CSV table of C-alpha atoms in Angstrom, one decimal:
chain,number,residue,atom,x,y,z
A,1,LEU,CA,8.6,2.8,13.5
A,2,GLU,CA,7.4,4.6,15.9
A,3,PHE,CA,6.0,3.1,19.3
A,4,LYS,CA,4.6,3.9,23.0
A,5,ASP,CA,9.9,-1.6,37.6
A,6,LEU,CA,12.6,-4.1,37.4
A,7,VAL,CA,14.7,-7.7,38.8
A,8,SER,CA,17.9,-8.8,39.0
A,9,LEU,CA,18.6,-11.5,35.8
A,10,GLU,CA,20.3,-14.4,38.8
A,11,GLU,CA,17.4,-14.0,41.1
A,12,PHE,CA,15.3,-14.6,38.4
A,13,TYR,CA,16.7,-17.4,37.8
A,14,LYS,CA,16.5,-18.5,40.5
A,15,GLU,CA,13.1,-17.8,43.0
A,16,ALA,CA,10.9,-18.0,39.8
A,17,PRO,CA,9.1,-22.0,39.3
A,18,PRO,CA,10.1,-24.0,36.3
A,19,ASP,CA,6.6,-23.9,34.7
A,20,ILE,CA,7.5,-19.9,34.9
A,21,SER,CA,10.9,-19.7,34.7
A,22,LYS,CA,10.3,-21.1,31.1
A,23,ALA,CA,13.5,-22.7,30.7
A,24,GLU,CA,13.5,-22.8,26.9
A,25,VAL,CA,13.2,-19.0,27.0
A,26,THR,CA,17.3,-19.0,28.5
A,27,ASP,CA,14.7,-15.7,23.2
A,28,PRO,CA,14.9,-11.4,25.8
A,29,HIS,CA,11.4,-12.1,24.3
A,30,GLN,CA,10.3,-14.9,26.6
A,31,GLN,CA,12.3,-13.8,29.0
A,32,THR,CA,11.3,-10.5,29.6
A,33,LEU,CA,7.4,-11.9,29.0
A,34,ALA,CA,8.5,-13.7,32.2
A,35,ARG,CA,10.4,-10.8,34.2
A,36,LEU,CA,6.2,-9.4,33.4
A,37,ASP,CA,4.4,-12.3,35.0
A,38,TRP,CA,6.2,-13.3,37.3
A,39,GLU,CA,6.6,-9.5,38.4
A,40,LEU,CA,2.5,-10.0,38.6
A,41,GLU,CA,2.1,-13.0,39.8
B,1,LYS,CA,10.4,-5.3,2.9
B,2,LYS,CA,12.3,-7.5,5.1
B,3,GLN,CA,13.4,-4.6,7.9
B,4,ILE,CA,9.2,-4.0,8.0
B,5,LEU,CA,8.9,-7.0,8.5
B,6,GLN,CA,11.3,-7.3,11.7
B,7,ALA,CA,9.9,-3.8,12.2
B,8,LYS,CA,6.0,-5.6,12.8
B,9,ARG,CA,6.9,-8.0,14.2
B,10,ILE,CA,9.1,-5.8,16.9
B,11,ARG,CA,5.7,-3.1,16.8
B,12,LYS,CA,4.0,-6.3,18.2
B,13,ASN,CA,6.3,-7.1,20.8
B,14,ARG,CA,6.4,-4.1,22.8
B,15,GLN,CA,2.9,-4.3,22.4
B,16,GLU,CA,3.1,-7.1,24.2
B,17,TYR,CA,5.1,-6.3,26.3
B,18,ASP,CA,2.6,-2.6,26.9
B,19,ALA,CA,0.0,-5.5,27.6
B,20,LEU,CA,0.9,-6.6,30.7
B,21,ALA,CA,2.4,-4.1,32.1
B,22,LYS,CA,-0.9,-1.7,32.0
B,23,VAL,CA,-2.7,-4.6,34.4
B,24,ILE,CA,0.6,-4.5,36.2
B,25,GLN,CA,0.1,-1.0,37.3
B,26,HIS,CA,-3.0,-1.5,38.4
B,27,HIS,CA,-1.5,-3.5,41.2
B,28,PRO,CA,0.5,-1.5,44.1
B,29,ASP,CA,4.2,-1.3,44.2
B,30,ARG,CA,6.5,-3.4,45.1
B,31,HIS,CA,9.3,-2.3,47.4
B,32,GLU,CA,6.7,-0.2,49.5
B,33,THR,CA,4.7,-3.5,49.3
B,34,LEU,CA,7.8,-5.0,51.2
B,35,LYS,CA,8.7,-2.1,53.4
B,36,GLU,CA,4.8,-2.3,54.7
B,37,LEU,CA,5.2,-6.1,55.0
B,38,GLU,CA,8.1,-5.5,57.0
B,39,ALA,CA,6.2,-3.3,59.0
B,40,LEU,CA,3.8,-5.4,60.0
B,41,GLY,CA,6.0,-8.5,60.4
B,42,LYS,CA,7.5,-6.2,63.6
B,43,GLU,CA,4.2,-5.5,64.8
B,44,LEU,CA,3.1,-8.8,64.2
B,45,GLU,CA,6.3,-10.1,66.1
B,46,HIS,CA,5.2,-6.8,68.6
B,47,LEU,CA,1.4,-8.1,69.5
B,48,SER,CA,3.2,-11.9,69.4
B,49,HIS,CA,5.5,-11.3,72.8
B,50,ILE,CA,2.5,-9.3,74.7
B,51,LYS,CA,-0.3,-11.7,74.3
C,1,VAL,CA,-31.8,-3.7,-10.2
C,2,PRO,CA,-34.1,-6.8,-10.8
C,3,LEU,CA,-31.7,-8.5,-13.6
C,4,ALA,CA,-32.4,-12.1,-13.8
C,5,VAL,CA,-36.2,-12.7,-13.1
C,6,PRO,CA,-36.6,-17.3,-12.2
C,7,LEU,CA,-40.0,-17.8,-14.6
C,8,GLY,CA,-40.1,-20.9,-13.6
C,9,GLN,CA,-41.2,-23.5,-10.6
C,10,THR,CA,-37.3,-25.0,-10.5
C,11,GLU,CA,-36.0,-21.8,-11.7
C,12,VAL,CA,-37.8,-20.4,-8.3
C,13,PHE,CA,-36.8,-22.8,-5.8
C,14,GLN,CA,-33.5,-22.5,-7.2
C,15,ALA,CA,-33.3,-18.1,-6.6
C,16,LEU,CA,-35.2,-19.5,-2.9
C,17,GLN,CA,-32.9,-22.0,-1.3
C,18,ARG,CA,-29.5,-19.6,-2.7
C,19,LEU,CA,-31.3,-16.3,-0.9
C,20,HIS,CA,-31.5,-19.4,3.2
C,21,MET,CA,-28.3,-20.3,2.4
C,22,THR,CA,-25.6,-20.2,5.1
C,23,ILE,CA,-21.8,-20.9,4.1
C,24,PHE,CA,-20.7,-22.1,8.0
C,25,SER,CA,-17.0,-23.8,5.8
C,26,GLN,CA,-13.9,-23.0,4.6
C,27,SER,CA,-11.0,-25.3,3.2
C,28,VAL,CA,-8.2,-24.1,1.0
C,29,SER,CA,-6.1,-26.8,-1.2
C,30,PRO,CA,-2.9,-27.9,-0.2
C,31,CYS,CA,-1.9,-25.4,-3.4
C,32,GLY,CA,-3.0,-22.5,-3.2
C,33,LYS,CA,-5.0,-22.7,-6.1
C,34,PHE,CA,-8.4,-23.9,-5.0
C,35,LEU,CA,-10.8,-23.3,-2.4
C,36,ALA,CA,-13.8,-25.3,-0.8
C,37,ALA,CA,-17.0,-24.0,0.6
C,38,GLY,CA,-19.5,-26.4,2.7
C,39,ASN,CA,-23.2,-25.5,3.0
C,40,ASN,CA,-26.8,-25.2,4.4
C,41,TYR,CA,-27.5,-27.9,2.6
C,42,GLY,CA,-25.2,-31.0,3.0
C,43,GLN,CA,-23.8,-29.9,-0.5
C,44,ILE,CA,-19.6,-28.1,-1.0
C,45,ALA,CA,-18.4,-26.1,-3.2
C,46,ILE,CA,-14.9,-26.3,-5.3
C,47,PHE,CA,-13.8,-22.6,-5.6
C,48,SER,CA,-10.9,-22.0,-8.3
C,49,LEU,CA,-9.1,-19.2,-6.8
C,50,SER,CA,-6.8,-18.6,-9.1
C,51,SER,CA,-8.5,-18.3,-12.2
C,52,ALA,CA,-10.9,-16.2,-9.9
C,53,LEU,CA,-8.3,-14.3,-9.4
C,54,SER,CA,-6.5,-13.9,-13.1
C,55,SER,CA,-6.2,-11.3,-15.1
C,56,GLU,CA,-8.4,-12.7,-17.9
C,57,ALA,CA,-12.1,-13.4,-15.7
C,58,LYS,CA,-15.2,-14.0,-16.7
C,59,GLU,CA,-18.1,-13.6,-14.6
C,60,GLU,CA,-18.5,-17.8,-14.5
C,61,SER,CA,-15.5,-17.5,-13.8
C,62,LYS,CA,-17.0,-16.6,-10.0
C,63,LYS,CA,-18.8,-20.0,-9.4
C,64,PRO,CA,-18.5,-23.4,-8.2
C,65,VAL,CA,-16.4,-25.3,-11.1
C,66,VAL,CA,-17.4,-28.8,-8.9
C,67,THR,CA,-19.8,-28.6,-6.2
C,68,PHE,CA,-22.4,-32.7,-5.3
C,69,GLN,CA,-24.4,-33.6,-2.6
C,70,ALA,CA,-22.1,-34.7,0.2
C,71,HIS,CA,-23.6,-34.9,3.5
C,72,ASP,CA,-27.5,-35.2,4.7
C,73,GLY,CA,-26.9,-32.6,7.1
C,74,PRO,CA,-25.1,-29.1,7.0
C,75,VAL,CA,-21.6,-29.2,6.2
C,76,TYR,CA,-20.4,-28.3,9.8
C,77,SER,CA,-16.4,-28.2,9.5
C,78,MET,CA,-14.2,-28.3,6.9
C,79,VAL,CA,-10.1,-29.3,7.3
C,80,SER,CA,-7.6,-30.1,4.7
C,81,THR,CA,-4.0,-31.7,4.5
C,82,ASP,CA,-1.6,-32.4,2.3
C,83,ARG,CA,-3.5,-35.2,0.2
C,84,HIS,CA,-7.3,-35.1,1.8
C,85,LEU,CA,-10.1,-32.7,2.0
C,86,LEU,CA,-12.3,-33.8,5.8
C,87,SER,CA,-15.6,-33.4,5.4
C,88,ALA,CA,-17.6,-32.8,9.0
C,89,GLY,CA,-21.8,-33.2,8.3
C,90,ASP,CA,-23.7,-35.3,9.8
C,91,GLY,CA,-22.5,-37.0,12.7
C,92,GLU,CA,-19.6,-38.2,10.5
C,93,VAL,CA,-16.1,-37.1,9.1
C,94,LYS,CA,-15.9,-38.1,5.4
C,95,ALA,CA,-13.0,-38.3,2.9
C,96,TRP,CA,-12.4,-36.8,-0.5
C,97,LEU,CA,-9.2,-36.1,-2.1
C,98,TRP,CA,-8.7,-32.8,-4.1
C,99,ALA,CA,-7.6,-35.2,-7.3
C,100,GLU,CA,-10.4,-36.6,-8.0
C,101,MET,CA,-12.8,-34.2,-7.0
C,102,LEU,CA,-12.0,-32.3,-9.7
C,103,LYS,CA,-12.6,-35.3,-11.9
C,104,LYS,CA,-16.6,-36.4,-12.8
C,105,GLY,CA,-16.1,-39.9,-10.0
C,106,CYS,CA,-16.0,-37.7,-7.0
C,107,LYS,CA,-16.0,-41.2,-4.3
C,108,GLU,CA,-14.9,-40.6,-1.0
C,109,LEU,CA,-11.7,-42.6,0.8
C,110,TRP,CA,-13.7,-43.9,4.0
C,111,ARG,CA,-16.8,-43.2,6.6
C,112,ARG,CA,-15.5,-42.8,10.3
C,113,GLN,CA,-18.8,-42.1,13.1
C,114,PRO,CA,-17.0,-41.8,16.3
C,115,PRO,CA,-24.8,-34.8,18.0
C,116,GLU,CA,-22.8,-32.7,15.4
C,117,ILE,CA,-18.6,-31.9,14.5
C,118,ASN,CA,-19.0,-28.5,15.4
C,119,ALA,CA,-15.2,-27.8,15.3
C,120,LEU,CA,-12.1,-30.2,13.6
C,121,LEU,CA,-8.5,-30.2,14.6
C,122,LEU,CA,-5.9,-30.8,12.5
C,123,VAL,CA,-3.6,-32.6,14.5
C,124,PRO,CA,0.3,-32.2,13.5
C,125,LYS,CA,3.6,-34.3,14.8
C,126,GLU,CA,1.2,-37.4,14.5
C,127,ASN,CA,-1.4,-38.4,12.1
C,128,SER,CA,-5.0,-37.6,14.2
C,129,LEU,CA,-7.5,-35.6,14.2
C,130,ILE,CA,-9.3,-34.7,16.8
C,131,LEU,CA,-13.3,-34.8,17.2
C,132,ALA,CA,-15.6,-32.2,19.3
C,133,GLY,CA,-19.0,-31.0,19.2
C,134,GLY,CA,-22.8,-32.0,21.3
C,135,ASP,CA,-21.9,-35.4,22.4
C,136,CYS,CA,-20.0,-32.3,25.1
C,137,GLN,CA,-16.8,-35.6,24.3
C,138,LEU,CA,-13.6,-34.7,23.3
C,139,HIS,CA,-12.6,-37.8,20.1
C,140,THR,CA,-8.9,-38.6,19.2
C,141,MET,CA,-9.2,-40.5,15.8
C,142,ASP,CA,-5.6,-41.4,14.1
C,143,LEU,CA,-5.7,-40.9,10.4
C,144,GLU,CA,-4.3,-44.1,8.9
C,145,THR,CA,-6.5,-46.4,10.9
C,146,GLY,CA,-10.0,-45.4,11.8
C,147,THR,CA,-9.4,-46.5,15.7
C,148,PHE,CA,-10.1,-44.1,18.2
C,149,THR,CA,-8.0,-44.1,21.1
C,150,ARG,CA,-8.4,-40.9,23.6
C,151,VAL,CA,-12.2,-39.3,24.9
C,152,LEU,CA,-12.1,-36.2,26.8
C,153,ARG,CA,-14.5,-35.3,29.5
C,154,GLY,CA,-14.8,-31.3,30.7
C,155,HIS,CA,-17.3,-29.7,29.6
C,156,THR,CA,-21.1,-29.5,30.5
C,157,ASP,CA,-22.9,-28.2,26.9
C,158,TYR,CA,-21.5,-28.9,23.9
C,159,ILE,CA,-18.1,-27.4,22.2
C,160,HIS,CA,-17.9,-24.6,18.9
C,161,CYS,CA,-14.2,-24.6,18.9
C,162,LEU,CA,-10.9,-26.2,19.0
C,163,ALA,CA,-7.5,-24.4,19.5
C,164,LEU,CA,-3.9,-25.6,19.4
C,165,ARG,CA,-0.4,-24.6,20.7
C,166,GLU,CA,2.6,-27.3,20.4
C,167,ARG,CA,3.3,-26.8,24.3
C,168,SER,CA,3.1,-28.7,27.3
C,169,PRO,CA,-1.2,-28.1,27.1
C,170,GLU,CA,-1.5,-27.6,23.4
C,171,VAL,CA,-5.2,-27.9,23.4
C,172,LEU,CA,-7.6,-25.1,24.5
C,173,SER,CA,-11.5,-25.8,24.4
C,174,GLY,CA,-14.3,-24.1,23.9
C,175,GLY,CA,-17.9,-25.3,24.4
C,176,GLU,CA,-21.7,-23.3,24.9
C,177,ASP,CA,-20.9,-23.4,29.1
C,178,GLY,CA,-18.6,-20.9,29.1
C,179,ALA,CA,-15.5,-22.2,30.0
C,180,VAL,CA,-12.0,-22.6,28.0
C,181,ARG,CA,-10.6,-25.8,28.5
C,182,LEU,CA,-6.9,-26.6,28.4
C,183,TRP,CA,-6.5,-31.0,27.3
C,184,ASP,CA,-2.6,-32.3,27.7
C,185,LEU,CA,-2.8,-35.1,25.2
C,186,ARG,CA,0.6,-37.0,26.8
C,187,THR,CA,-2.3,-37.2,30.1
C,188,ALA,CA,-5.6,-37.0,28.3
C,189,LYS,CA,-6.3,-34.6,31.9
C,190,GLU,CA,-7.0,-31.8,32.3
C,191,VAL,CA,-5.6,-29.3,33.3
C,192,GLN,CA,-7.0,-26.0,33.6
C,193,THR,CA,-10.4,-23.9,33.8
C,194,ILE,CA,-11.0,-20.2,33.1
C,195,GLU,CA,-14.1,-19.5,33.0
C,196,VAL,CA,-15.4,-15.8,31.2
C,197,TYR,CA,-18.3,-14.9,32.5
C,198,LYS,CA,-17.3,-15.3,36.3
C,199,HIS,CA,-14.3,-12.9,35.0
C,200,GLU,CA,-16.9,-8.9,35.9
C,201,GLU,CA,-14.1,-7.2,33.6
C,202,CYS,CA,-16.3,-9.6,30.6
C,203,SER,CA,-19.9,-11.4,31.6
C,204,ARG,CA,-22.4,-9.2,29.5
C,205,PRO,CA,-24.9,-12.0,31.2
C,206,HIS,CA,-27.4,-10.0,28.4
C,207,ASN,CA,-26.2,-12.1,25.5
C,208,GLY,CA,-25.3,-15.2,27.5
C,209,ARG,CA,-22.3,-17.3,28.3
C,210,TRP,CA,-21.3,-19.2,25.1
C,211,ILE,CA,-17.8,-19.2,23.8
C,212,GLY,CA,-17.2,-19.4,20.0
C,213,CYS,CA,-14.2,-18.5,19.2
C,214,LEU,CA,-10.7,-19.5,20.3
C,215,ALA,CA,-7.4,-18.7,19.2
C,216,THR,CA,-4.0,-19.0,20.0
C,217,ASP,CA,0.4,-17.3,19.7
C,218,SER,CA,1.3,-19.8,22.1
C,219,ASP,CA,1.9,-17.5,25.5
C,220,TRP,CA,-1.7,-15.8,24.3
C,221,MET,CA,-5.3,-16.9,23.8
C,222,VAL,CA,-8.5,-14.7,22.2
C,223,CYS,CA,-12.1,-15.3,23.9
C,224,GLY,CA,-15.3,-14.4,22.8
C,225,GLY,CA,-18.5,-14.9,22.0
C,226,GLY,CA,-21.6,-14.3,24.1
C,227,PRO,CA,-19.8,-12.4,27.2
C,228,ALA,CA,-16.9,-9.8,25.6
C,229,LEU,CA,-13.5,-9.9,22.8
C,230,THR,CA,-10.8,-10.7,25.7
C,231,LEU,CA,-7.6,-10.6,25.8
C,232,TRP,CA,-5.8,-13.9,27.7
C,233,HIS,CA,-2.5,-14.4,29.3
C,234,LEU,CA,-2.1,-18.3,29.7
C,235,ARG,CA,0.1,-19.1,32.8
C,236,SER,CA,-1.4,-16.3,34.3
C,237,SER,CA,-5.4,-16.8,33.1
C,238,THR,CA,-5.2,-13.1,33.5
C,239,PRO,CA,-8.6,-11.0,32.1
C,240,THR,CA,-5.4,-8.6,30.0
C,241,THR,CA,-6.9,-6.1,26.8
C,242,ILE,CA,-11.4,-6.0,26.2
C,243,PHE,CA,-12.5,-5.2,22.5
C,244,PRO,CA,-14.6,-2.6,22.8
C,245,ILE,CA,-18.3,-4.2,20.9
C,246,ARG,CA,-21.5,-5.1,21.1
C,247,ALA,CA,-22.2,-6.9,18.3
C,248,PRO,CA,-21.6,-11.2,19.5
C,249,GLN,CA,-18.3,-12.2,16.8
C,250,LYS,CA,-18.3,-15.3,16.1
C,251,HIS,CA,-14.8,-16.5,15.3
C,252,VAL,CA,-11.4,-15.1,15.7
C,253,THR,CA,-8.1,-14.9,14.6
C,254,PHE,CA,-4.1,-13.9,14.6
C,255,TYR,CA,-3.3,-11.5,11.9
C,256,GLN,CA,0.5,-10.8,12.0
C,257,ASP,CA,0.0,-8.2,14.4
C,258,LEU,CA,-3.7,-7.7,13.9
C,259,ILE,CA,-6.7,-9.4,15.6
C,260,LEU,CA,-9.3,-9.8,12.5
C,261,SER,CA,-13.0,-10.8,14.3
C,262,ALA,CA,-16.7,-11.4,12.4
C,263,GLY,CA,-19.6,-11.4,13.5
C,264,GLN,CA,-23.6,-10.9,13.9
C,265,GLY,CA,-22.5,-7.4,12.0
C,266,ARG,CA,-21.7,-6.2,8.6
C,267,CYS,CA,-18.2,-6.0,8.7
C,268,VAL,CA,-15.1,-7.2,9.4
C,269,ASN,CA,-13.0,-6.4,12.4
C,270,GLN,CA,-9.5,-5.3,11.8
C,271,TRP,CA,-7.8,-4.4,15.6
C,272,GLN,CA,-5.0,-3.8,16.8
C,273,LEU,CA,-3.0,-5.4,20.1
C,274,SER,CA,-3.3,-3.2,22.4
C,275,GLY,CA,-7.9,-2.8,22.2
C,276,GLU,CA,-8.0,-0.3,19.3
C,277,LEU,CA,-10.2,-1.1,16.8
C,278,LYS,CA,-8.2,-0.2,14.0
C,279,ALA,CA,-10.4,-0.6,10.8
C,280,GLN,CA,-13.8,-1.3,10.0
C,281,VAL,CA,-14.4,-3.6,6.0
C,282,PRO,CA,-17.9,-4.0,4.7
C,283,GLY,CA,-18.4,-7.0,3.7
C,284,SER,CA,-21.7,-8.7,1.5
C,285,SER,CA,-23.6,-10.6,4.3
C,286,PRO,CA,-25.0,-9.4,6.9
C,287,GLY,CA,-23.6,-11.5,9.3
C,288,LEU,CA,-19.9,-14.3,9.8
C,289,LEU,CA,-19.2,-17.4,10.2
C,290,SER,CA,-16.2,-18.1,9.1
C,291,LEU,CA,-12.8,-16.6,7.7
C,292,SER,CA,-9.4,-18.2,6.3
C,293,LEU,CA,-6.0,-16.5,5.2
C,294,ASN,CA,-4.6,-18.5,2.7
C,295,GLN,CA,-1.4,-18.7,3.3
C,296,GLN,CA,0.1,-21.2,1.5
C,297,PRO,CA,3.3,-21.9,-0.4
C,298,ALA,CA,4.1,-22.4,-4.2
C,299,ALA,CA,0.8,-20.3,-4.7
C,300,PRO,CA,2.1,-16.6,-3.8
C,301,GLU,CA,-0.7,-15.2,-6.0
C,302,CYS,CA,-3.4,-17.1,-4.0
C,303,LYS,CA,-3.2,-14.8,-1.0
C,304,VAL,CA,-6.5,-13.9,0.4
C,305,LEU,CA,-8.4,-13.4,3.1
C,306,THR,CA,-11.9,-15.0,2.2
C,307,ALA,CA,-14.7,-14.5,4.5
C,308,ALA,CA,-18.3,-16.0,4.5
C,309,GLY,CA,-21.2,-16.3,6.4
C,310,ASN,CA,-25.2,-15.9,5.9
C,311,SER,CA,-25.8,-15.3,1.9
C,312,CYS,CA,-25.1,-17.6,-0.3
C,313,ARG,CA,-21.7,-16.0,-1.4
C,314,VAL,CA,-18.0,-15.8,-0.7
C,315,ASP,CA,-16.2,-11.8,0.0
C,316,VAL,CA,-12.6,-12.5,-1.0
C,317,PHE,CA,-10.9,-9.4,0.0
C,318,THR,CA,-6.7,-9.2,-2.1
C,319,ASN,CA,-6.7,-5.7,0.4
C,320,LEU,CA,-7.6,-5.0,3.9
C,321,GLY,CA,-9.6,-2.7,3.0
C,322,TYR,CA,-12.3,-3.3,0.4
C,323,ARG,CA,-13.8,-6.4,-0.5
C,324,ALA,CA,-12.4,-7.6,-4.4
C,325,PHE,CA,-14.8,-9.4,-5.5
C,326,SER,CA,-17.6,-12.1,-4.3
C,327,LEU,CA,-17.7,-15.7,-5.1
C,328,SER,CA,-21.5,-16.6,-5.9
C,329,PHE,CA,-22.0,-20.7,-4.3
């Protein structure tokens, strides 16, 4: 049990293309991964 | 056993998050890029008006 | 140290065949109880894995209960279904029954022929089988009737491995040309290409450009072989992390939260997903070509990691820090 910026949610959900929006994630894990690679792109 | 399975899954998720975040941190910031894009857009509009 | 001296032409010839044996493929039964190993000489051994892992175990229990000649050329790939064992040999795929291969009959069900066949991909959600090899083309075959539906032409040189991740592209394929290609099954077209040698973080021009292994986590990819053992992010096609190892890696897979690897070295390599070498467990072979996690229901006692390569023996790992024993061919 030891381990090691952001976008507004509606802006992220309404600006990203549906390839990167990943409407099947609407899990929080894939949601955060979609936020991360949307920030990267 | 059930809690340690969930713990190792959460650890894999955290390592995926760190793996993406390290690649993002090789790129410059977001808001500073927005500020310099606004400055470059104003300078480009002034240079376009002068041209 | 030389315990058994052969002393005879037939036994010297058998010792020479065992000394020059390479084990290419591995398959598991529908239950956990049996293992199948493919051979350099086109043979197939069947390993009673539950009898080897039992408390009552003899030295002759680490032997094939049934071994049989099955192909003319080498057996490069096996795969298993709910009932069958599909084996790709010379240039064609044979099918064998798990119920009948233990008996004395050992007949084949069919013989379908679409160069070698390096990778067999068994596709769920539809009874299908993807053939890939020296034809540089992906063939799709129905399992019920021996008809070939789709032919996919994207690679330049031959293919080493296939993958599956249950999304819209759903099929990865890596080859000797040095590019991982994505193959949408509906449109039967190529939708994305990732050239790993073009990226300077991964290149390593001494070993060359060939992709030997692929793996999927439905969002990620591990690509290795010639260039480097690299972690790619799909939908971005960006090299995220590199695993620092010198030897080329012939096989890779995802564990629970580890990365298992094996190649021209002696040991099995256990990586963390960040890119830290967690462990190196030495095997009995000088090089390994195949790993297999035996994660099957209705037999929890047959949950081991089996490794095979340039030897006549299979290393069985009951734990991930040491080898328990090894099955002679």
